[PDB]
Design an enzyme around this catalytic site. Structure first.
Site, PDB file in Angstrom:
ATOM      1  N   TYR A  21       6.325  71.663 108.321  1.00  0.00           N
ATOM      2  CA  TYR A  21       7.513  72.423 107.917  1.00  0.00           C
ATOM      3  C   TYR A  21       6.901  73.432 106.955  1.00  0.00           C
ATOM      4  O   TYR A  21       6.768  74.614 107.282  1.00  0.00           O
ATOM      5  CB  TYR A  21       8.570  71.604 107.187  1.00  0.00           C
ATOM      6  CG  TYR A  21       9.813  72.448 106.982  1.00  0.00           C
ATOM      7  CD1 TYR A  21      10.191  72.892 105.707  1.00  0.00           C
ATOM      8  CD2 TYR A  21      10.558  72.893 108.084  1.00  0.00           C
ATOM      9  CE1 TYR A  21      11.277  73.762 105.539  1.00  0.00           C
ATOM     10  CE2 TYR A  21      11.640  73.764 107.924  1.00  0.00           C
ATOM     11  CZ  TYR A  21      11.989  74.194 106.652  1.00  0.00           C
ATOM     12  OH  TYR A  21      13.026  75.087 106.510  1.00  0.00           O
ATOM     13  N   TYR A  39      11.151  77.045 109.742  1.00  0.00           N
ATOM     14  CA  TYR A  39      10.058  77.547 108.920  1.00  0.00           C
ATOM     15  C   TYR A  39       8.773  76.920 109.486  1.00  0.00           C
ATOM     16  O   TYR A  39       7.729  77.565 109.546  1.00  0.00           O
ATOM     17  CB  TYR A  39      10.240  77.172 107.448  1.00  0.00           C
ATOM     18  CG  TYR A  39       9.280  77.921 106.516  1.00  0.00           C
ATOM     19  CD1 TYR A  39       7.921  77.581 106.451  1.00  0.00           C
ATOM     20  CD2 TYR A  39       9.726  79.000 105.746  1.00  0.00           C
ATOM     21  CE1 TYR A  39       7.029  78.300 105.642  1.00  0.00           C
ATOM     22  CE2 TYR A  39       8.851  79.732 104.935  1.00  0.00           C
ATOM     23  CZ  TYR A  39       7.505  79.377 104.886  1.00  0.00           C
ATOM     24  OH  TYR A  39       6.647  80.081 104.078  1.00  0.00           O
TER      25      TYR A  39
HETATM   26  N1  LIG Z   1      18.338  78.762 105.336  1.00  0.00           N
HETATM   27  C1  LIG Z   1      17.626  77.623 104.751  1.00  0.00           C
HETATM   28  C2  LIG Z   1      18.600  76.729 103.948  1.00  0.00           C
HETATM   29  C3  LIG Z   1      17.876  75.501 103.329  1.00  0.00           C
HETATM   30  N2  LIG Z   1      18.859  74.663 102.564  1.00  0.00           N
HETATM   31  C4  LIG Z   1      18.207  73.812 101.523  1.00  0.00           C
HETATM   32  C5  LIG Z   1      19.234  73.120 100.579  1.00  0.00           C
HETATM   33  N3  LIG Z   1      20.444  72.658 101.314  1.00  0.00           N
HETATM   34  C6  LIG Z   1      20.718  72.949 102.598  1.00  0.00           C
HETATM   35  N4  LIG Z   1      21.868  72.390 102.970  1.00  0.00           N
HETATM   36  N5  LIG Z   1      22.322  71.764 101.989  1.00  0.00           N
HETATM   37  C7  LIG Z   1      21.483  71.886 100.935  1.00  0.00           C
HETATM   38  C8  LIG Z   1      21.701  71.254  99.559  1.00  0.00           C
HETATM   39  F1  LIG Z   1      22.844  70.567  99.567  1.00  0.00           F
HETATM   40  F2  LIG Z   1      20.675  70.443  99.326  1.00  0.00           F
HETATM   41  F3  LIG Z   1      21.734  72.235  98.663  1.00  0.00           F
HETATM   42  C9  LIG Z   1      19.770  73.810 103.429  1.00  0.00           C
HETATM   43  C10 LIG Z   1      17.126  74.711 104.452  1.00  0.00           C
HETATM   44  C11 LIG Z   1      16.142  75.601 105.238  1.00  0.00           C
HETATM   45  C12 LIG Z   1      16.889  76.804 105.870  1.00  0.00           C
HETATM   46  C13 LIG Z   1      15.966  77.699 106.677  1.00  0.00           C
HETATM   47  C14 LIG Z   1      14.764  78.259 106.137  1.00  0.00           C
HETATM   48  C15 LIG Z   1      13.958  79.088 106.956  1.00  0.00           C
HETATM   49  F4  LIG Z   1      12.832  79.605 106.447  1.00  0.00           F
HETATM   50  C16 LIG Z   1      14.335  79.369 108.291  1.00  0.00           C
HETATM   51  F5  LIG Z   1      13.582  80.144 109.062  1.00  0.00           F
HETATM   52  C17 LIG Z   1      15.509  78.833 108.835  1.00  0.00           C
HETATM   53  C18 LIG Z   1      16.296  78.016 108.025  1.00  0.00           C
HETATM   54  F6  LIG Z   1      17.405  77.520 108.571  1.00  0.00           F
END
Ligand SMILES: N[C@H]1C[C@@H](N2CCn3c(nnc3C(F)(F)F)C2)CC[C@@H]1c1cc(F)c(F)cc1F
Ligand SMILES: N[C@H]1C[C@@H](N2CCn3c(nnc3C(F)(F)F)C2)CC[C@@H]1c1cc(F)c(F)cc1F
Ligand SMILES: *[C@@H]1O[C@H](CO)[C@@H](O[C@@H]2O[C@H](CO)[C@@H](O)[C@H](O)[C@H]2NC(C)=O)[C@H](O)[C@H]1NC(C)=O
Ligand SMILES: *[C@@H]1O[C@H](CO)[C@@H](O[C@@H]2O[C@H](CO)[C@@H](O)[C@H](O)[C@H]2NC(C)=O)[C@H](O)[C@H]1NC(C)=O
Ligand SMILES: *[C@@H]1O[C@H](CO)[C@@H](O[C@@H]2O[C@H](CO)[C@@H](O)[C@H](O)[C@H]2NC(C)=O)[C@H](O)[C@H]1NC(C)=O
Ligand SMILES: *[C@@H]1O[C@H](CO)[C@@H](O[C@@H]2O[C@H](CO)[C@@H](O)[C@H](O)[C@H]2NC(C)=O)[C@H](O)[C@H]1NC(C)=O
Ligand SMILES: *[C@@H]1O[C@H](CO)[C@@H](O[C@@H]2O[C@H](CO)[C@@H](O)[C@H](O)[C@H]2NC(C)=O)[C@H](O)[C@H]1NC(C)=O
Ligand SMILES: *[C@@H]1O[C@H](CO)[C@@H](O[C@@H]2O[C@H](CO)[C@@H](O)[C@H](O)[C@H]2NC(C)=O)[C@H](O)[C@H]1NC(C)=O
Ligand SMILES: *[C@@H]1O[C@H](CO)[C@@H](O[C@H]2O[C@H](CO)[C@@H](O)[C@H](O)[C@H]2NC(C)=O)[C@H](O)[C@H]1NC(C)=O
Ligand SMILES: *[C@@H]1O[C@H](CO)[C@@H](O[C@H]2O[C@H](CO)[C@@H](O)[C@H](O)[C@H]2NC(C)=O)[C@H](O)[C@H]1NC(C)=O
Ligand SMILES: *[C@H]1O[C@H](CO)[C@@H](O[C@@H]2O[C@H](CO)[C@@H](O)[C@H](O)[C@H]2NC(C)=O)[C@H](O)[C@H]1NC(C)=O
Ligand SMILES: *[C@@H]1O[C@H](CO)[C@@H](O)[C@H](O)[C@H]1NC(C)=O
Ligand SMILES: *[C@@H]1O[C@H](CO)[C@@H](O)[C@H](O)[C@H]1NC(C)=O
Ligand SMILES: *[C@@H]1O[C@H](CO)[C@@H](O)[C@H](O)[C@H]1NC(C)=O
Ligand SMILES: *[C@@H]1O[C@H](CO)[C@@H](O)[C@H](O)[C@H]1NC(C)=O
Ligand SMILES: *[C@@H]1O[C@H](CO)[C@@H](O)[C@H](O)[C@H]1NC(C)=O
Ligand SMILES: *[C@@H]1O[C@H](CO)[C@@H](O)[C@H](O)[C@H]1NC(C)=O
Ligand code: NA
Lengths: 728, 728
Positions: free
Chosen positions: B509, B593
């Protein structure tokens, strides 16, 4: 040991086929480009001169894509900034060069983004389309006269076709026709206001941040079609009135009752034009013959000069009703139509008499009428030796029909069985183009005595190179099914041994009026597969194929996806019986209509094929365009043919793909067979848990012809075939 | 002899982990659904009663997706007609059932296609969004009050987030925040008027003749971002005669100077709310603390109560500024922030005092603050045994920070090293959720003396089943790089034999703050690969990974596509030197990612990997969204970081793919990482003549999670990996 014809040979084009493309500029002279120089040749003696030095446009500042000399030889149209569009359409910039004054015209230039331009048939008048409106220039350096004001992008098209008219009706982008001496300019106007739009993404260069959405008026089967109108304007009056009137010629009442198409426009004389209309149900066409009325400045078409052409067994024409060829006085014309037996032959018509007279007949067909003189009509047919896949030039005496001479049959019977021809302006000379079964041969002949003048190109250079290569051979023969002969061809590996079992690849197309078995010489992928990989590549023309009469061509009427598919399966079984085929290694592949048939075959459950490849396939007829689809399938409504439309999809056979290895390929910017068609096949396969191979080609269209994509796809398909056949 | 964990076991969920999801409704009881019946449990004794019968809605007519009981237990919100949108968003229909009168409410019901709904924190008021506007209901059976009137599809969002705020800022569709006792309702309003829209095709069922074009306001890096405003409305003074008045709270001047975001809203008291704002250059954030003025009826935020949070080494927070945890009186709060050593710890703030005091410290990090009482603050950290991939619950005595007590470390050290927790309303009780390294274990505890009351679910059924399966083991260790340790894990095949050479698959990842080496128990694709195919599946946490301090996490600031990619190659290089790894059979794969990193690795020319698989990878940062991308990369302008944006693409490395087997996969309806990203990769590979494998999934989004597509992609990747490794 001599080398074989490899994949790189095909992709890099190491063994180049030479041709001889000339352009007649009169009855005895033609232009030919030699070393970037445009030479002018004297047909009678073969001597030439430099028409335009290759250094003339050295500092033009642009790479000229093409040129066009005005009929009177006084000017030349330079086409640069070539931007391809669909099959025939494209965009480009243009400049005009005064050949006499040897100067380039700098004032009143043809606008940029000009959609189409054409010289008058005589002199140097010009008509072009810009922003969907028509413009006419009487003189190259003078202001243009605007002819239409309704032009509107993707909505109203004046003088140019919309997507479906370009692809399925006229096979040309242009929708304007100059009268013989250039006085009148006739044209069509298409209204796509209610035609639904196909939308797809175009990614472009990596630098484009947001993909672009391409949107084009495209009527799928059963959808709202564009409507059309026809007009004629007198260009000789442009400089005398502020706004010349475009006189409309309305379609006959028999067409106005419902949806219809304008399918042919042909001038007969300076003051007589013929128009053919076709009903949305393509088995009924009507030709009007209209004369100019000098007192009313109007165009009238006497019903006594109207000709009807219909079909009880299928659609009209091979792909559209045939074009008429008028005698000089415009009082009679010749047209190819199927006789009572179902074979297409030349019929002679008096413009005001409904019953024509057939001038040719037999269990073979006329391919086209090439020229007409006061004494002879020249045509191409496959009569010779009863070979539907051969083509020869014939001459028939107009004053005595029993006098028919074949002008090409015996020229070189072993090397040449497939001819096309090009006559000079008044048919005083003609170039014969032999394209097989041996290396292409180009020759020049005099019509006055039918004597060979000289060989223009014999491909001796290539013949030399091919001597050191183990080239495959081609067999053209037939098998008899139900008392009927069905032709096929086989590309056989070098040193073919009938005592061995070779893997077989069935190369298929099989659309209506198609012909995959012929005498043409080709250097293609199959060449490599047979030569290097020792694979037999075969093709078969079963029910639905053309040039063999309506009984065979119209067999799939209202039933696409059946007989033509089944006959392809039966063809493989027959090739198995021949004894030199490894029944465990039979594959099949096709592009376009061929991809559909390949898919249908792979999903039939026949057990005959191990693997298959479909490139840009149709998957369900309701996704394809109205004109082509409805011609063979009628309408997708419960009252017409919806049941068969729903029963002939690739998706409904998804489950059977569990028995084969499948590779599905499609260009994402395919404006013709939309990517949607393969998107639905893959989704159907995913839904029943079927594994398969796939490949999309970013921004490639139906041709997947860009240099890099072409090499990539054939390279990818080769690995897949070699793997399926357990070949190193 | 016994069976292994097969691909079918993973896809059909043969072995299921049991959970125990409860819902605290007070400080003494919780709700738990059992056999479709909602039971209410008493935490102290474990005795329960049926709260609502499963049959109660037997003739409801609709399939209920979820339920939500009002805080006072008087009503229950029934969710049905669920229609998913993005990661968190969806629309549905709702019905309210009166638990007292045992009757479904029929008057003034919530509309269909409601975008979001939520009970007030106390009592039974309701707030919902419909057609982008906010509505409030004081009583379930009474008419609602329109709060906003500006709602406009894809343009103005009231009470709900647009695409980027949903995905990258709030991780929620809701943008509504009730005050503690329900008096006030705060909300944000987003304006996407000038945000460009991403457009892509949706094919839908085979029956749709023309593909649909989906359009979503989505700002790519550097593009125009949505703007935001914040409002607070008093719901206790709503009138049916006059339109509600919403009081706006503007952002500080330090934010209004340029583009910014609202990134957190947290109520402190019944009349005090805190908001954190973030600049578009995400290394400077500001917290405002606002108090309600009963005199003017306005909300004022004293500058003396402003708290600035900035970073000199990278961005602010893990993915965003942390949320504050206010004391009962709201006069002070606790918040996790990076200390001077770059380790995230809990700091204690006085609302009108600029300096905060760190209450925890060390070379480890606090993951989150879980509960706060006047005596203790409870939190999860990875301090135990110095393992960054382990999680335990701790409590710290607020009167003496030297008194820290681990509450989960020693409960079962062999089976449990990764905990999550759920506290009752006043922290009187807490549920511990252990998720590894052994099977998940759920337990209930009482805070007063930290007693272990009972085991709620120990997964003994699964344990019994797994006894008859040859399960793989997991090794969690670390390697050293420049005096720094980096952790990795390896899923080892059953009966691992260090004397044999196993092929290895690097599961990657590696995004900023990611963690792929941990103590969590998982049954996934890797389980099958190790158990059935005897493949070692390793993961490594290199530079840029989280929970180890900013020195490691910020090492890739403004430099994505560099160190995190180099480190994966370094790890694999080291694994390839170990005695049990076949250096001829090393592969790599990642999703999202991870797909980007896999692609950058494969195109690095390192020669360490034989093959690799990229699923929905980012290929050029300018194609990804602004909030996420700019956080790490700054702006793509020549004055800022455009050069690194341009040489951190996959496309530029196309030539290096010549020596590897590559499988590229992507869903056509991916709204997150647009298909465009993979379309540009394939085109670049085609342009340099590199062959590769591909697969598109029609209409699947970033999760490629529909049942059939999920089975199909993993089935397809399995064949690719086995073939690459020469496995039967
Ligand atoms: N866009 C990004 C949103 C991220 N969040 C982290 C924290 N989170 C999330 N959901 N809920 C929480 C939390 F509750 F923990 F805050 C998702 C997870 C990776 C995601 C992402 C990153 C990329 F490089 C990509 F290419 C495509 C992608 F999809
Ligand atoms: N749409 C169809 C047009 C047709 N034309 C025949 C006549 N013609 C052409 N070019 N020039 C001429 C001629 F000059 F002969 F008129 C092409 C060739 C096949 C084309 C076709 C058929 C399909 F089922 C399909 F799935 C995709 C497709 F593309
Ligand atoms: C090809 O050659 C012919 C004759 O061989 C050229 O005809 C010219 O005819 C004029 C008549 O006025 C004579 O004055 C010239 O002397 C002829 N030329 C020659 C070479 O005899 C004809 O112009 C030539 N055509 C081309 C294209 O070169
Ligand atoms: C092209 O066809 C459309 C019909 O689809 C014509 O548009 C109509 O024009 C009339 C007369 O002005 C209006 O009353 C209607 O409202 C229009 N209908 C639609 C759907 O737009 C249009 O005039 C035609 N254009 C030409 C140049 O013939
Ligand atoms: C030339 O004549 C045509 C036809 O009369 C004019 O086109 C008409 O223009 C009027 C007003 O602009 C419209 O109401 C009509 O619908 C148009 N008819 C057609 C067939 O287009 C055109 O405007 C004239 N051009 C000039 C310069 O006068
Ligand atoms: C091209 O043909 C047109 C149509 O026959 C000719 O125009 C006519 O010419 C006659 C004189 O012979 C006039 O009486 C008519 O008024 C013209 N009719 C029209 C519609 O213009 C034209 O002269 C011919 N052009 C050439 C160069 O011969
Ligand atoms: C929630 O808190 C609010 C704000 O403190 C309470 O409303 C205030 O109540 C006092 C005493 O009744 C009034 O004098 C104020 O005017 C109210 N302020 C506002 C802004 O309305 C409210 O009573 C509390 N609600 C509950 C259920 O306890
Ligand atoms: C937040 O980060 C930005 C960008 O890294 C810093 O702003 C400037 O960034 C440019 C490069 O884009 C450098 O040349 C400047 O030296 C940076 N500083 C300034 C004042 O422009 C900004 O300094 C960072 N903010 C903090 C508090 O560290
Ligand atoms: C769990 O057990 C307790 C005591 O055994 C139940 O009893 C309490 O609440 C009842 C009604 O809710 C009353 O009838 C009891 O008098 C009361 N007892 C005490 C000591 O307070 C309790 O309800 C049970 N809870 C559940 C959810 O079943
Ligand atoms: C949403 O934001 C837009 C601007 O992004 C506001 O409109 C402004 O921008 C328009 C063009 O984009 C200008 O033509 C307008 O003059 C300008 N101001 C107004 C009042 O339109 C728009 O009003 C905002 N909408 C809301 C509800 O705040
Ligand atoms: C939301 O949609 C539902 C479904 O249409 C509405 O329920 C009624 O459904 C019946 C039959 O299914 C129809 O006869 C009615 O037209 C629908 N509406 C009513 C009022 O009966 C439901 O009412 C809608 N809810 C809201 C708040 O608009
Ligand atoms: C014409 O230009 C070509 C360059 O393409 C050159 O090789 C040739 O020599 C020129 N023609 C003559 C007759 O020299
Ligand atoms: C065509 O457009 C180009 C691009 O702006 C310009 O250089 C040129 O002058 C134009 N030529 C004509 C004939 O309009
Ligand atoms: C044309 O086709 C339709 C549909 O098959 C048919 O009903 C009609 O009779 C046909 N017309 C002619 C002239 O054959
Ligand atoms: C509720 O329904 C389920 C089936 O969905 C059934 O198994 C269960 O027995 C029912 N509840 C009770 C308490 O019987
Ligand atoms: C509330 O505001 C809306 C929009 O401004 C308006 O249309 C409506 O009439 C108002 N209602 C009242 C009671 O003022
Ligand atoms: C230290 O190690 C890192 C990687 O961990 C490497 O990039 C760097 O060059 C090494 N030396 C220094 C001085 O950072
Ligand atoms: Na206990």
């Amino acid at each position: 040991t001599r080398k074989t014809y490899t994949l790189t040979d095909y992709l890099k084009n190491t063994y180049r086929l030479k041709l001889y493309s000339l352009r007649w500029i009169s009855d005895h002279e033609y232009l030919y480009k030699q070393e970037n120089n445009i030479l002018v040749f004297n047909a009678e003696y073969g001597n030439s001169s430099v028409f335009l030095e290759n250094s003339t446009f050295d500092e033009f500042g642009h790479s000229i894509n093409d040129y066009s000399i005005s009929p009177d030889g006084q000017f030349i149209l330079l086409e640069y900034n070539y931007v391809k569009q669909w099959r025939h359409s494209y965009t480009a910039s243009y400049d005009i060069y005064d050949l006499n004054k040897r100067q380039l015209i700098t004032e009143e230039r043809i606008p940029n983004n000009t959609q189409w331009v054409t010289w008058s048939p005589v002199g140097h008048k010009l008509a072009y389309v810009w922003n969907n409106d028509i413009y006419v220039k009487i003189e190259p350096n003078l202001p243009s006269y605007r002819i239409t004001w309704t032009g509107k992008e993707d909505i109203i098209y004046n003088g140019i076709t919309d997507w479906v008219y370009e692809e399925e009706v006229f096979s040309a982008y242009s929708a304007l026709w100059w009268s013989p001496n250039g006085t009148f300019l006739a044209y069509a106007q298409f209204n796509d206001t209610e035609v639904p739009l196909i939308e797809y993404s175009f990614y472009s260069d990596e630098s484009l941040q947001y993909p672009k959405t391409v949107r084009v008026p495209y009527p799928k089967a059963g959808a709202v079609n564009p409507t059309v109108k026809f007009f004629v304007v007198n260009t000789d009056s442009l400089s005398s009135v502020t706004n010349a009137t475009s006189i409309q010629i309305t379609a006959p009442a028999s067409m106005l009752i419902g949806d219809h198409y304008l399918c042919d426009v042909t001038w007969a004389t300076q003051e007589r034009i013929s128009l053919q209309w076709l009903r949305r149900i393509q088995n009924y066409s009507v030709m009007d013959i209209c004369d100019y009325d000098e007192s009313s400045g109007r165009w009238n078409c006497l019903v006594a000069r109207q000709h009807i052409e219909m079909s009880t067994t299928g659609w009209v024409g091979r792909f559209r009703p045939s074009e008429p060829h008028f005698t000089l006085d415009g009082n009679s014309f010749y047209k190819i139509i199927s006789n009572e037996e179902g074979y297409r032959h030349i019929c002679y018509f008096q413009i005001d008499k409904k019953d024509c007279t057939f001038i040719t007949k037999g269990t073979w067909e006329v391919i086209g009428i090439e020229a007409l003189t006061s004494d002879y009509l020249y045509y191409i047919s496959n009569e010779y030796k009863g070979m539907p896949g051969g083509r020869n030039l014939y001459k028939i005496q107009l004053s005595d029909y029993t006098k028919v001479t074949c002008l090409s049959c015996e020229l070189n019977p072993e090397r040449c069985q497939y001819y096309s021809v090009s006559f000079s302006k008044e048919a005083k000379y003609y170039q014969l183009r032999c394209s097989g079964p041996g290396l292409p041969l180009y020759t020049l002949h005099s019509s006055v005595n039918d004597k060979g003048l000289r060989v223009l190109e014999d491909n001796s250079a290539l013949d030399k190179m091919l001597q050191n290569v183990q080239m495959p051979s081609k067999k053209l023969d037939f098998i008899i099914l139900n008392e009927t002969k069905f032709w096929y061809q086989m590309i056989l590996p070098p040193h073919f041994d009938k005592s061995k079992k070779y893997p077989l690849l069935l190369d298929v197309y099989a659309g209506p009026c198609s012909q995959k078995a012929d005498t043409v010489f080709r250097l293609n992928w199959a060449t490599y597969l047979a030569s290097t990989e020792n694979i037999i590549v075969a093709s078969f023309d079963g029910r639905g194929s053309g040039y063999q009469g309506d009984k065979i061509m119209h067999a799939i009427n209202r039933r696409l996806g059946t007989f033509e598919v089944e006959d392809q399966i039966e063809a493989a079984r027959q090739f198995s019986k021949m004894g030199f085929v490894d029944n465990k290694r039979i594959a099949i592949w096709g592009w376009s209509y061929g991809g559909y048939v390949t898919s249908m075959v792979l999903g039939s459950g026949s057990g005959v094929f191990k693997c298959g490849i479909a490139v840009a396939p149709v998957s369900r007829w309701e996704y394809y365009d109205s004109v082509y689809t409805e011609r063979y399938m009628g309408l997708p409504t419960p009252e017409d043919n919806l049941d068969h439309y729903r029963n002939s999809t690739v998706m409904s056979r998804a489950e059977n793909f569990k028995q084969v290895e499948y590779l599905l390929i499609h260009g994402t910017a395919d404006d013709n067979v939309h990517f949607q068609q393969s998107a639905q096949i893959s989704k159907a396969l995913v839904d029943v848990g079927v594994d398969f191979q796939a490949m999309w080609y970013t921004d490639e269209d139906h041709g997947i012809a860009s240099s890099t994509a072409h090499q990539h796809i054939y390279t990818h398909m080769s690995h897949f075939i070699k793997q399926c056949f357990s070949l190193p």
